[PDB]
Coordinates of C-alpha atoms and ligand atoms in Angstrom, one line a residue:
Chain A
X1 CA -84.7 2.4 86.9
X2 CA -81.0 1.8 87.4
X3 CA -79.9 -1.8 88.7
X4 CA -76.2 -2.7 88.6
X5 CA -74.5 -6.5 88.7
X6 CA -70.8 -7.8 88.5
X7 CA -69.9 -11.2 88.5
X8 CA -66.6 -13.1 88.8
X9 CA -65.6 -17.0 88.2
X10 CA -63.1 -19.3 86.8
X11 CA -62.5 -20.2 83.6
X12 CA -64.2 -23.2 83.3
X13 CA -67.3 -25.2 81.0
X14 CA -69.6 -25.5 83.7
X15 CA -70.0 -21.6 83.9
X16 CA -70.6 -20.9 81.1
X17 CA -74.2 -22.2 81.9
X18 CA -73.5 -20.4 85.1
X19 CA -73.7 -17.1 83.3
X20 CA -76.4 -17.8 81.0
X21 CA -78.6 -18.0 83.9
X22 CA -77.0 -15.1 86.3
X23 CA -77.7 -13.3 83.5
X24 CA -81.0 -14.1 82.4
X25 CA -82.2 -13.4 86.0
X26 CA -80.9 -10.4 86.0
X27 CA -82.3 -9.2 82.8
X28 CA -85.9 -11.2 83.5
X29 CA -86.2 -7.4 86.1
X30 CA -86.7 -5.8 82.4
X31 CA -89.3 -8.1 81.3
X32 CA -88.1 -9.3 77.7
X33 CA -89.5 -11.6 75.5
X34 CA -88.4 -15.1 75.6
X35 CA -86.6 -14.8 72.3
X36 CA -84.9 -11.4 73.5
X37 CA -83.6 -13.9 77.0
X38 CA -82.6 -16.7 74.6
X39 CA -80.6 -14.6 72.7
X40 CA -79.6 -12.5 75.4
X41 CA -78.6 -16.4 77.0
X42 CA -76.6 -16.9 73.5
X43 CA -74.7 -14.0 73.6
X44 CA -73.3 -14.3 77.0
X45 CA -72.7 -18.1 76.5
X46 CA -70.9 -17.0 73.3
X47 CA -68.5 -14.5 75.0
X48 CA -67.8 -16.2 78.0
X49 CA -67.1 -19.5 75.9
X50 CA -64.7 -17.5 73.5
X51 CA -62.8 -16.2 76.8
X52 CA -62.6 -19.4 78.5
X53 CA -61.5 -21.6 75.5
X54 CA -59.6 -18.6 73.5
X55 CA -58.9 -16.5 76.2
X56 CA -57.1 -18.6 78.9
X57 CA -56.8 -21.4 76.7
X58 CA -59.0 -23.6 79.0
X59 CA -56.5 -23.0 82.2
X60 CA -59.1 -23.3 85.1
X61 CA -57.2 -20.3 86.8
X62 CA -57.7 -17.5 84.5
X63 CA -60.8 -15.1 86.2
X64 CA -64.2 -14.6 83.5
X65 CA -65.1 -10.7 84.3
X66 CA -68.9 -10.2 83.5
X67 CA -71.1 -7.3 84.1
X68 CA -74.4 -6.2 83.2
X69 CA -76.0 -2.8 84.2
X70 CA -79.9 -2.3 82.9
X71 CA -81.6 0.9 82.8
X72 CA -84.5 2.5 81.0
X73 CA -85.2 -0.6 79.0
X74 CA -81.5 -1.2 77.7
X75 CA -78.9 -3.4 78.3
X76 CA -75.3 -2.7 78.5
X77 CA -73.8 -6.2 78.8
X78 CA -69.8 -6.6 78.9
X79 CA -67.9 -9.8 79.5
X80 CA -63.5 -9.4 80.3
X81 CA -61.2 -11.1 80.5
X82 CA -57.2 -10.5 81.5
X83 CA -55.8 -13.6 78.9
X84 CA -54.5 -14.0 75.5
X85 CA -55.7 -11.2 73.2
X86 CA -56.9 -11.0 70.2
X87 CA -54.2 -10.0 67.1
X88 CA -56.5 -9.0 64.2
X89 CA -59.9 -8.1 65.8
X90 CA -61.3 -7.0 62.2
X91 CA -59.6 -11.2 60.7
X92 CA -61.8 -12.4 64.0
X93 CA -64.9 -10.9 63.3
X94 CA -65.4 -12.7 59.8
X95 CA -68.2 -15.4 59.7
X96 CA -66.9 -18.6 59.8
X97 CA -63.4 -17.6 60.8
X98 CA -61.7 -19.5 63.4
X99 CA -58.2 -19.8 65.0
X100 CA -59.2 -23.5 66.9
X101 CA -61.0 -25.5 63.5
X102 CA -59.3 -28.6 64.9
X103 CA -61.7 -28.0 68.3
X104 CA -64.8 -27.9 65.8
X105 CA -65.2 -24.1 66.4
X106 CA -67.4 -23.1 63.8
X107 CA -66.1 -20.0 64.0
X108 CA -69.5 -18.1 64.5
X109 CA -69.4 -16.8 67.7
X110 CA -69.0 -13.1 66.9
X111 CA -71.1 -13.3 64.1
X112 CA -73.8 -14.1 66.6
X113 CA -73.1 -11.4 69.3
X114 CA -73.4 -8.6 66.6
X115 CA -76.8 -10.0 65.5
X116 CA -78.5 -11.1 68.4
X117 CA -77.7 -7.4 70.3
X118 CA -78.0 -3.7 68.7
X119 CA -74.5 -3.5 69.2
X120 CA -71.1 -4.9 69.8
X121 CA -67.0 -3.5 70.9
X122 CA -64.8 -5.8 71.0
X123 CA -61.3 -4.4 72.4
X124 CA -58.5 -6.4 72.9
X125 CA -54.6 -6.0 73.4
X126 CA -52.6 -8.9 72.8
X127 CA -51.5 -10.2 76.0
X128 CA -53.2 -8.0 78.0
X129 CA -56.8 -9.2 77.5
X130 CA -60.2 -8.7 75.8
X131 CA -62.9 -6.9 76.6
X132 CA -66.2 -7.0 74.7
X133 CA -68.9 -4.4 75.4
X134 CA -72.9 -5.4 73.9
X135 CA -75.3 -3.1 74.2
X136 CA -79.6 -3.9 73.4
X137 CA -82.6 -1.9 73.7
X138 CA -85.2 -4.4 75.3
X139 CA -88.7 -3.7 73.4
X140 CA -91.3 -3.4 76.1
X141 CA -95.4 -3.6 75.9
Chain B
X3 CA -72.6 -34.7 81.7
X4 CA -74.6 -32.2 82.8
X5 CA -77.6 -29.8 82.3
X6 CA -77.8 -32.1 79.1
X7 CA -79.2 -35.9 79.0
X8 CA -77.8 -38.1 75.6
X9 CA -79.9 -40.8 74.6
X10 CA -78.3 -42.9 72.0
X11 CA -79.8 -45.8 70.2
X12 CA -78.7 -47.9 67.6
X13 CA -80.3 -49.6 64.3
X14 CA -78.6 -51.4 62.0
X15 CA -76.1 -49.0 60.6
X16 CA -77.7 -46.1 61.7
X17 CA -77.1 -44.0 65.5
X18 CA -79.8 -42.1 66.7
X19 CA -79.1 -39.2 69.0
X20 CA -81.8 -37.8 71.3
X21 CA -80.2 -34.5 72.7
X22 CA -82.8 -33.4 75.8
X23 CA -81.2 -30.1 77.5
X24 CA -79.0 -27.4 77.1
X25 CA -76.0 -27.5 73.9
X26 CA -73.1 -25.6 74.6
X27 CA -69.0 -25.9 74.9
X28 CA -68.9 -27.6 78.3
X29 CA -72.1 -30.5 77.6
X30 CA -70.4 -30.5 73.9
X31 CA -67.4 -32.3 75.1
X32 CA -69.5 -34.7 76.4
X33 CA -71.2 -35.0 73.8
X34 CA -68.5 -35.8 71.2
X35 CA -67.0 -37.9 72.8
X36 CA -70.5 -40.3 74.0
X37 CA -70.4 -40.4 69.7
X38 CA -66.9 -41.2 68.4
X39 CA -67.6 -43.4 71.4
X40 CA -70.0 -45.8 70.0
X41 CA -68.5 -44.9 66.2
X42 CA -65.4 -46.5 67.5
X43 CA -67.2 -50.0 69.0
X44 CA -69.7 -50.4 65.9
X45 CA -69.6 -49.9 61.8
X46 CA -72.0 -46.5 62.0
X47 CA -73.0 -45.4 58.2
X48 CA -75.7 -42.9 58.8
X49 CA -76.6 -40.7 62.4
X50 CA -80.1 -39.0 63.0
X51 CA -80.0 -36.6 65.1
X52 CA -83.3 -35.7 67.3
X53 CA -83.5 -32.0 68.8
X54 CA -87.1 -32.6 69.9
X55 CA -85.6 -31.6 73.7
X56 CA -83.6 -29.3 73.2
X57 CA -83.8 -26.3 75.2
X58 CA -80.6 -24.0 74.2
X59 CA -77.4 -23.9 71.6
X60 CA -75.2 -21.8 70.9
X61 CA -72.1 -21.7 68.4
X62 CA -70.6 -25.1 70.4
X63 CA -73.5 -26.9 69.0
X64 CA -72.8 -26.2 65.1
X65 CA -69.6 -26.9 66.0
X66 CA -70.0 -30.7 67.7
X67 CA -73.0 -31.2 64.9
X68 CA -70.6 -30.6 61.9
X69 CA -67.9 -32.3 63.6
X70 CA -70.0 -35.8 63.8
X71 CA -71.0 -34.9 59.9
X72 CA -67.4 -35.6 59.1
X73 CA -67.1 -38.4 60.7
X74 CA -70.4 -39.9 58.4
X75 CA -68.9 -38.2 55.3
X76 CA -65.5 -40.1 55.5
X77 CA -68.4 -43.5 55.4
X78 CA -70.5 -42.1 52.6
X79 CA -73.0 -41.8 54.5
X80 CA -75.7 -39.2 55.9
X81 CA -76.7 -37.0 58.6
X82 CA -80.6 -36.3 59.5
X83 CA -81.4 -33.9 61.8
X84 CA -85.0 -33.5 63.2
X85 CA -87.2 -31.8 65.6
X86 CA -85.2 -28.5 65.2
X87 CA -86.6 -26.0 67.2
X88 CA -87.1 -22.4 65.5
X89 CA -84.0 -21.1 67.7
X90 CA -82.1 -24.0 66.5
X91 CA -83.0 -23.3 63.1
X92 CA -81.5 -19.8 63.3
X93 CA -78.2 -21.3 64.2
X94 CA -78.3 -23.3 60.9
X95 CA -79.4 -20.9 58.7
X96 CA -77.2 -18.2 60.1
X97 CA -74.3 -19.9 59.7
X98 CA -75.2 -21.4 56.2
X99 CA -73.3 -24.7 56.7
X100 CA -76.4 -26.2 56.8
X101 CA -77.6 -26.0 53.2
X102 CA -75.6 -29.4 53.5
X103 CA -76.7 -31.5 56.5
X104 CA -80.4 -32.4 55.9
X105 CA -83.4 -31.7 58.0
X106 CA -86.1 -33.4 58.8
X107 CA -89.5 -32.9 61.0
X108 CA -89.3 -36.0 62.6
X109 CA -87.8 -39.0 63.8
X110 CA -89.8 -41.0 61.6
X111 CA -89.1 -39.2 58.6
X112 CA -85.5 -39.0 58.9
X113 CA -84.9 -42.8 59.2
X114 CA -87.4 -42.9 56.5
X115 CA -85.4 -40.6 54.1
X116 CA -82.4 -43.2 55.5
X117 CA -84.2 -46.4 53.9
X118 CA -84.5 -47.5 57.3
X119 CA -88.0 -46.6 58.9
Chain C
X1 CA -62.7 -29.3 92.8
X2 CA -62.3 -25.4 93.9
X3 CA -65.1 -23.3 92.2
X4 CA -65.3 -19.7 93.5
X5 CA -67.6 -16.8 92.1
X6 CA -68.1 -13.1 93.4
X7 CA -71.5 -11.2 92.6
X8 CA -72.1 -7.6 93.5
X9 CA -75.1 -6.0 92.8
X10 CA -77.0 -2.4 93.7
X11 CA -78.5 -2.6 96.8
X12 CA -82.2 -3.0 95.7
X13 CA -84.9 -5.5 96.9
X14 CA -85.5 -7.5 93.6
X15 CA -82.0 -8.3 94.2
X16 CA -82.6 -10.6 96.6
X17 CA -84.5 -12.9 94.6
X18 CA -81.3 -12.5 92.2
X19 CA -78.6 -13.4 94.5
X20 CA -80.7 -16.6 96.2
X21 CA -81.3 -17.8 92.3
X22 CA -77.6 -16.9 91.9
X23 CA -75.8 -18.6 94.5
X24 CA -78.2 -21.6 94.0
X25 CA -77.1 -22.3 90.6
X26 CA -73.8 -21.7 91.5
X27 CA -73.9 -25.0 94.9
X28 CA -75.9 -26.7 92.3
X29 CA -73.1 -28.4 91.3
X30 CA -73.0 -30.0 94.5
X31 CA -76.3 -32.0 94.3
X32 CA -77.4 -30.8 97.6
X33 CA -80.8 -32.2 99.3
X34 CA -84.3 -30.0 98.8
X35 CA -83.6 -28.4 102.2
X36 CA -79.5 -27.9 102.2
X37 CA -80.6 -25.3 99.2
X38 CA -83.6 -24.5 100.8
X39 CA -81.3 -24.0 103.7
X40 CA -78.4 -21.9 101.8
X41 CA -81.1 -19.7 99.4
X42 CA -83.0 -18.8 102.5
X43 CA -79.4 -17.4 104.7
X44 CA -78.3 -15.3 101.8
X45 CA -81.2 -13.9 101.7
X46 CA -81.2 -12.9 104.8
X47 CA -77.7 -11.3 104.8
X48 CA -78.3 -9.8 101.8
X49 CA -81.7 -8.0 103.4
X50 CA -79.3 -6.7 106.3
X51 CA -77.4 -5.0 103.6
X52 CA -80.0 -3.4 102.0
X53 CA -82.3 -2.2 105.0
X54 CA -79.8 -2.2 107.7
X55 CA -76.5 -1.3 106.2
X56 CA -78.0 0.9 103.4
X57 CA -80.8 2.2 104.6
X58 CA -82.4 1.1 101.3
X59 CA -80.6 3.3 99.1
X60 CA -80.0 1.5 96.0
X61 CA -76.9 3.6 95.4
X62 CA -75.4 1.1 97.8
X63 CA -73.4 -2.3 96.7
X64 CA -73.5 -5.6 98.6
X65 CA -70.9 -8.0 97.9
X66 CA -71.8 -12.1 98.0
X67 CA -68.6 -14.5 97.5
X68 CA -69.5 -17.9 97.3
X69 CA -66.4 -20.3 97.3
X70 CA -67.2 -24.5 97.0
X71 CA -64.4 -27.0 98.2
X72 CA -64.1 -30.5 99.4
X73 CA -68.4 -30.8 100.0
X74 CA -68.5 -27.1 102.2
X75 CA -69.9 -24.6 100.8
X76 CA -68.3 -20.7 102.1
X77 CA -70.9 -17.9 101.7
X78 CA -70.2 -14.1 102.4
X79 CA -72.3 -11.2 102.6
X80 CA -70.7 -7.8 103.0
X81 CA -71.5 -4.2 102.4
X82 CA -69.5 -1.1 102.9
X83 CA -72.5 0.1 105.1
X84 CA -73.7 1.8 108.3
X85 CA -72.1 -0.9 110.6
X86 CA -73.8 -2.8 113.6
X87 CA -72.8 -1.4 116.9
X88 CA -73.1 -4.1 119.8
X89 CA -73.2 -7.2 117.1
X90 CA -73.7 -9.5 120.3
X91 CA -77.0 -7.5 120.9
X92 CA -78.1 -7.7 117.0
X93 CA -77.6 -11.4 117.2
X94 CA -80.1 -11.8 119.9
X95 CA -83.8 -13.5 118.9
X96 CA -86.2 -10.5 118.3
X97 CA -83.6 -7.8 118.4
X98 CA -84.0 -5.0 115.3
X99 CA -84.0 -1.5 115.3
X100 CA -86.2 -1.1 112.4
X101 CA -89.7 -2.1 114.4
X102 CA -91.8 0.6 112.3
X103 CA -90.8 -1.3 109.2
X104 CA -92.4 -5.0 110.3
X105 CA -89.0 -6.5 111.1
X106 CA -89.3 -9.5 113.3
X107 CA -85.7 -9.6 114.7
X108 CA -85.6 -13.2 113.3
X109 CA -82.9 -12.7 110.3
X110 CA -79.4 -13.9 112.5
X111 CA -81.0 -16.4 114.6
X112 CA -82.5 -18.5 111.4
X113 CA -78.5 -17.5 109.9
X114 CA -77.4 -19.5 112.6
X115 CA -80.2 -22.9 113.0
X116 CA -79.5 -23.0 109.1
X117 CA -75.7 -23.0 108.9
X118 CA -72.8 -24.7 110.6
X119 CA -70.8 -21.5 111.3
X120 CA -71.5 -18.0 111.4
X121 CA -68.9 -14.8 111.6
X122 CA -70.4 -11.2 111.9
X123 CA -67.9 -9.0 111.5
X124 CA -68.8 -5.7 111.6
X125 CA -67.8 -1.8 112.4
X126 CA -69.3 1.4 112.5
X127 CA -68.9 3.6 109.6
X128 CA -67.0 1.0 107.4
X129 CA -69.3 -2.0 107.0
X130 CA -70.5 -5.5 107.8
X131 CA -69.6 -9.0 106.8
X132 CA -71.3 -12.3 107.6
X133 CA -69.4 -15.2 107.1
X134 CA -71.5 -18.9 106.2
X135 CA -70.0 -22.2 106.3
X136 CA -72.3 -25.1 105.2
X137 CA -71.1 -28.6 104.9
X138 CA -73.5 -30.4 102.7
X139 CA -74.3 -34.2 103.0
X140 CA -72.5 -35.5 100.0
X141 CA -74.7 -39.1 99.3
Chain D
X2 CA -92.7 -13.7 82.7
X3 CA -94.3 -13.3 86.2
X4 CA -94.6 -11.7 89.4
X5 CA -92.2 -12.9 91.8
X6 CA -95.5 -13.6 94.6
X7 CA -99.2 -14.1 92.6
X8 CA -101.7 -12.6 95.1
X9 CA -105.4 -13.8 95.4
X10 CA -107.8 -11.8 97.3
X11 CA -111.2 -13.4 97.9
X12 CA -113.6 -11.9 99.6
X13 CA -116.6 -13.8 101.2
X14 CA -118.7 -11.9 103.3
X15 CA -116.8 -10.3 106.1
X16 CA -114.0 -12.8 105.7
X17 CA -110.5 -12.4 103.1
X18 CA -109.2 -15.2 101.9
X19 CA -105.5 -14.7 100.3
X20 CA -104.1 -17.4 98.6
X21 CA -100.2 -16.9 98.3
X22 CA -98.1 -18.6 95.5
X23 CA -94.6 -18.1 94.8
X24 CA -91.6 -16.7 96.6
X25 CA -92.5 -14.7 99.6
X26 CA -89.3 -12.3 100.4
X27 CA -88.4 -8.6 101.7
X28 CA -88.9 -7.7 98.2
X29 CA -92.5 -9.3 97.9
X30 CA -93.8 -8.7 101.4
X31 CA -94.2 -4.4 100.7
X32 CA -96.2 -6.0 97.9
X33 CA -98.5 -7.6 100.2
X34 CA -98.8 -5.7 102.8
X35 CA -100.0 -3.0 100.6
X36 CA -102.8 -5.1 98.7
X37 CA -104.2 -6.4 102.1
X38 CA -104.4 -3.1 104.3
X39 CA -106.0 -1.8 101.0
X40 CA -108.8 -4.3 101.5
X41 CA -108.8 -3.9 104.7
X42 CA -110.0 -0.1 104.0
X43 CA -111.7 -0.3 101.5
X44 CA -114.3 -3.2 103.1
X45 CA -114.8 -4.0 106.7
X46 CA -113.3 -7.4 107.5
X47 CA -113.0 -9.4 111.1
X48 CA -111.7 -12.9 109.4
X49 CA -108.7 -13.6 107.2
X50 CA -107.3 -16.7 106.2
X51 CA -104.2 -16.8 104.5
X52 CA -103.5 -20.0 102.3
X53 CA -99.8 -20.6 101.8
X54 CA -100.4 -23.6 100.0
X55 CA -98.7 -22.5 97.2
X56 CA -95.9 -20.8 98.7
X57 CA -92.8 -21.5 97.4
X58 CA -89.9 -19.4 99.6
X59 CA -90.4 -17.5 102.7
X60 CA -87.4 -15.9 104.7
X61 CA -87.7 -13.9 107.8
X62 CA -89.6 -10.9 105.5
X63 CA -92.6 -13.2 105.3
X64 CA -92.8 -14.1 109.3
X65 CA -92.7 -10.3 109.9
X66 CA -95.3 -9.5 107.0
X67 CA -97.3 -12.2 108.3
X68 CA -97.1 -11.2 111.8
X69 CA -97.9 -7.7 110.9
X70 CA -101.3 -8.7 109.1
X71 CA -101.9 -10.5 112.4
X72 CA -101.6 -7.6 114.6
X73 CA -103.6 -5.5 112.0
X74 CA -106.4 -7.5 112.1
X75 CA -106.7 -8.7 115.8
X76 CA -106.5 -4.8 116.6
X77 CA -110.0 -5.1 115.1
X78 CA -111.9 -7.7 116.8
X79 CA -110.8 -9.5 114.4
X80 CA -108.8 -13.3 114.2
X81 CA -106.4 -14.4 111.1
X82 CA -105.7 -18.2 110.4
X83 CA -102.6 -19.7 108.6
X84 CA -103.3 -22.7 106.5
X85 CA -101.4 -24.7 104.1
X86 CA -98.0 -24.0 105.6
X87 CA -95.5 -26.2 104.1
X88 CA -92.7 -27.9 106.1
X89 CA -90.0 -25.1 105.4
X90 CA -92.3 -22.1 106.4
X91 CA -93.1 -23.9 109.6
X92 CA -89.8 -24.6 110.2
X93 CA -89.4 -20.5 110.5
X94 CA -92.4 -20.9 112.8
X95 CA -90.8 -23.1 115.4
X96 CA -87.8 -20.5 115.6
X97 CA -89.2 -18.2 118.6
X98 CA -92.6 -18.9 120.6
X99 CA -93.6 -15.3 119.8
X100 CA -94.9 -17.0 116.6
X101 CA -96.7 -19.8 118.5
X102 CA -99.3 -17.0 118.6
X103 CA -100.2 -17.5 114.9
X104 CA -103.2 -20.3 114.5
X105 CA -102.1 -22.8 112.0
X106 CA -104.9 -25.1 110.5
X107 CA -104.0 -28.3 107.7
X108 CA -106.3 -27.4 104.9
X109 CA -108.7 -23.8 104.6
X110 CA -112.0 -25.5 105.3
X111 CA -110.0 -26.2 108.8
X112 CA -108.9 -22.8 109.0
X113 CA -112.5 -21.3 108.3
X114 CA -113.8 -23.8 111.3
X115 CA -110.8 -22.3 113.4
X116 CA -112.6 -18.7 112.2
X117 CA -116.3 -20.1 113.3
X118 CA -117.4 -19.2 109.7
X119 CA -118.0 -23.1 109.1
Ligands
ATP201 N1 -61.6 -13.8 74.7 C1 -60.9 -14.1 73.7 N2 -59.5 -14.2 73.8 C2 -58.7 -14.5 72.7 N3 -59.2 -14.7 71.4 C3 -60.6 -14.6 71.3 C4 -61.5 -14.3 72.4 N4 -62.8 -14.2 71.9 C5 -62.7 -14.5 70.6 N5 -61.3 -14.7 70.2 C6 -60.8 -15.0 68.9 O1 -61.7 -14.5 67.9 C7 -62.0 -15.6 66.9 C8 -63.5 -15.6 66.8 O2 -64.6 -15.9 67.2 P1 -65.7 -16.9 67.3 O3 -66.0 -16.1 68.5 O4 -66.5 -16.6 66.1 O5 -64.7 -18.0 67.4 P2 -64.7 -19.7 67.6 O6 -64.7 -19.5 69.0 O7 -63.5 -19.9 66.8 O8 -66.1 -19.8 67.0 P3 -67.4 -20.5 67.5 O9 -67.6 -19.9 68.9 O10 -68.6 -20.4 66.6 O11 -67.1 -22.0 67.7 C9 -61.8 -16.9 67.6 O12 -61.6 -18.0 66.8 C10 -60.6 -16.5 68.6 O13 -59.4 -16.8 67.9
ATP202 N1 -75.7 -5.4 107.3 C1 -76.1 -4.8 108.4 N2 -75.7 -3.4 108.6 C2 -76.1 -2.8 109.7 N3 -76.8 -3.3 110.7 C3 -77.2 -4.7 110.5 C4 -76.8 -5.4 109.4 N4 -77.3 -6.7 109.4 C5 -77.9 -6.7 110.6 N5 -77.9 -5.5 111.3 C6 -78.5 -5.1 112.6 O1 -78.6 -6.3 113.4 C7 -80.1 -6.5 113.6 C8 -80.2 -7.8 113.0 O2 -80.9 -8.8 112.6 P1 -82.1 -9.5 111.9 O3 -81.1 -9.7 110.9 O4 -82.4 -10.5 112.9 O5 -82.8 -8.1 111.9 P2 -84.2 -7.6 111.3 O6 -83.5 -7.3 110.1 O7 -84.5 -6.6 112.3 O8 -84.9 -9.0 111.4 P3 -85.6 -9.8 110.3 O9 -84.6 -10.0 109.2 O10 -86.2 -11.1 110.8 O11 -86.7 -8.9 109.8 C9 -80.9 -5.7 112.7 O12 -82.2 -5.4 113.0 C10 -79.9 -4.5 112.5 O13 -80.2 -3.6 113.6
MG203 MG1 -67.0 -18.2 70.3
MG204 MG1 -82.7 -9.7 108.7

């Protein structure tokens, strides 16, 4: 099977529960286990958080670009956004590292992403935007 | 706030925090500031922190955690976390800043490890 | 304050159950009475249907686009898809009315669209698509 | 997990009994249809009582599914009985007299009384 979703909102807190559960419905069509949809929920509330609060700097304007396509049991998750960039993707990537300490980041957002999903991109051109791609193979009984 | 319910109760130098819900960025804001809240009207040494209800965290929820732990550090005193679901618990262990805060099973045995209960 | 989202999926049954979920997580923040959602899950269901029988055909290739948009207690649903088109729209809107009889269709769809919502719009053209407009005030208490 | 509509076929003598639970859509209806016509084949029924008790959506898919079962078995000598209709799914009822045609008992001993089976 092929199914296809894209979803658009504001940068703002309450979405990013939002799109933990957008998600998860949308994923629930591959039956996963519930630790596969809780981490599948983490992920997405991890990048969507990072573009919000990194991204557009909390501005309520800036426009949280998610989309998820499943097929054949895997997932191809990717959350965009047009803000601030990222300057050093490889720096950003480190556990623990964090660019907002004084905002009790703990700086282990990505660190996350590329363990709860088989893979992670992250792309990003300063000022342009960033775009992170996560892809996971969905075990099925 | 929302999707998240903070019950907070006080004993004798100690805050309890009863987290019941969902932990991220948004319901961690309001959670912070609930805290420094009461941290701010009363002489708080220790804070135990009870994740019995607690139905999702992600980063956001290290992040408040730790930030509360500094605020009991700068007292000398300690920070008890219990109930921790297993989801929780790979959170803490992941991002190893919790070989510091300690962690108990219950509410009981935190306040007990306090000198209180 | 001015929440907006924008979902778009492939035009596929299970979606249904998607979008209502979706767009009822997305009024939640309104605190809306049992039967206001009831009310609002149940019309974008309907529209959504349209697209994917009527507009589509059922072919899942097909996208249909939902833009919810809260603001000052109203809630602004759309339902569009760049489908077949609905030739007399006055006729379609009429109780019992469908053109897909071998399929069980009652012909009930637009006329619980309109006992369920303050305002409907059917726009609509052959060969380019159709879009249903919702407006729903909801009883703040 | 789960299946979007749980379906309960019970069969007592010449009469089905389908409990519904869940959400009852375009989606779900093909679903049903297909499970009841495939009892209906497979054993001779004249009764059926459908128990939407436990229903928790319906949108114009389940009025037409339901209407569909309806002609199916009246086209039989047969009668079908809708109990347990919640005040939403009534609410579709009351859109169009066509629908009026549908007997609607409170609980399912009612509805088997409505059936003359009890
Ligand atoms: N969408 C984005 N736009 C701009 N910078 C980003 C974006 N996503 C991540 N970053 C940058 O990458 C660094 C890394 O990630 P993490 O995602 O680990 O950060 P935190 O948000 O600082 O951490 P945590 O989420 O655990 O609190 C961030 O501190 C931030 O500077
Ligand atoms: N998106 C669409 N594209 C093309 N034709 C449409 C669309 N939506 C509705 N129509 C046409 O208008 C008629 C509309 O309404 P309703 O929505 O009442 O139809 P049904 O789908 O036939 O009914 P029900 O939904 O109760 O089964 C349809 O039967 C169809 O002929
Ligand atoms: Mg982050
Ligand atoms: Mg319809």
């Amino acid at each position: 099977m092929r199914n296809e979703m894209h979803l658009q909102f504001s940068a703002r807190s309450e979405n990013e529960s939002f799109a933990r559960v957008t998600v998860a419905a949308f994923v629930a069509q591959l039956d996963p286990t519930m630790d596969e949809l809780t981490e599948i929920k983490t992920v997405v509330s991890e990048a969507v958080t990072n573009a919000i609060i990194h991204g557009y700097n909390n501005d309520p304007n800036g426009i949280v670009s998610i989309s998820v396509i499943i097929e054949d049991g895997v997932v191809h998750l990717t959350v965009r956004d047009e803000g601030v960039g990222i300057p050093d993707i490889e720096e950003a990537r480190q556990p623990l590292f964090t660019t907002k300490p004084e905002l009790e980041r703990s700086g282990m957002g990505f660190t996350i992403m590329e363990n709860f999903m088989d893979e992670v991109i992250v792309e990003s051109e300063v000022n342009k935007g960033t775009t992170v791609y996560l892809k996971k193979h969905i075990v099925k009984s | 706030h929302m999707s998240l319910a903070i019950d907070l109760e006080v004993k004798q130098d100690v805050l309890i925090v009863r987290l019941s819900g969902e932990l991220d960025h948004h319901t961690a804001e309001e959670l912070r500031e609930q805290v420094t809240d009461v941290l701010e009207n009363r002489a708080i040494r220790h804070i135990v922190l009870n994740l019995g209800q607690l139905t999702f965290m992600d980063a956001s929820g290290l992040g408040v955690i730790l930030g509360r732990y500094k605020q009991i550090k700068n007292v000398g005193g300690q920070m008890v976390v219990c109930a921790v679901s297993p989801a929780v618990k790979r959170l803490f262990d992941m991002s190893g800043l919790f070989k510091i805060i300690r962690v108990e099973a219950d509410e009981q045995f935190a306040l007990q490890a306090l000198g209180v209960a």
